[PDB]
Amino acid sequence: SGAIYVGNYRVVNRHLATHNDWANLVWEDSSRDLLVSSTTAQGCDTIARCDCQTGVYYCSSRRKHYPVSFSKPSLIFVEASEYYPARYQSHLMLAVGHSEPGDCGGILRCQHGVVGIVSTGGNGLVGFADVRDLLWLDEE
Numbered sequence: 001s002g003a004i005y006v007g008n009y010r011v012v013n014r015h016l017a018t019h020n021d022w023a024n025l026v027w028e029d030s031s032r033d034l035l036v037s038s039t040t041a042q043g044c045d046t047i048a049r050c051d052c053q054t055g056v057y058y059c060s061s062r063r064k065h066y067p068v069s070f071s072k073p074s075l076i077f078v079e080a081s082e083y084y085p086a087r088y089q090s091h092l093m094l095a096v097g098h099s100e101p102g103d104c105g106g107i108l109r110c111q112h113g114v115v116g117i118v119s120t121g122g123n124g125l126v127g128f129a130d131v132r133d134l135l136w137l138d139e140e
């Protein structure tokens, strides 16, 4: 589990979105596994605005923060998980690392802020849904 709280936005994995999230929907994209909802309270998270490919992500299944190198956001085939069929996922970044389904929503950060959230796993890779292209999270 996990979310990004930027301004009056909450960013979650689309597959983990709640009724409240859908009742307060701003934007969602199945192909990216992202959903953004509106919040009453101001969040304090900063979205990274950069092309960094090194960062640190939180892995809840190991209670560890792992430094990782990660790929550029791309359209990648993802094998079946407990929450999606085998399919193409867009704006996805891969690293070598541990990811169980419960690790979805772990934050990946660099010196510039939040890069993305864990969205995929298996075959010894961890996949992160990028958020750095969503410049509208910074305003409104």
Ligand SMILES: [Zn+2]
Pocket: 048, 049, 050, 051, 052, 110, 111, 112, 113
């Ligand atoms: Zn960065």
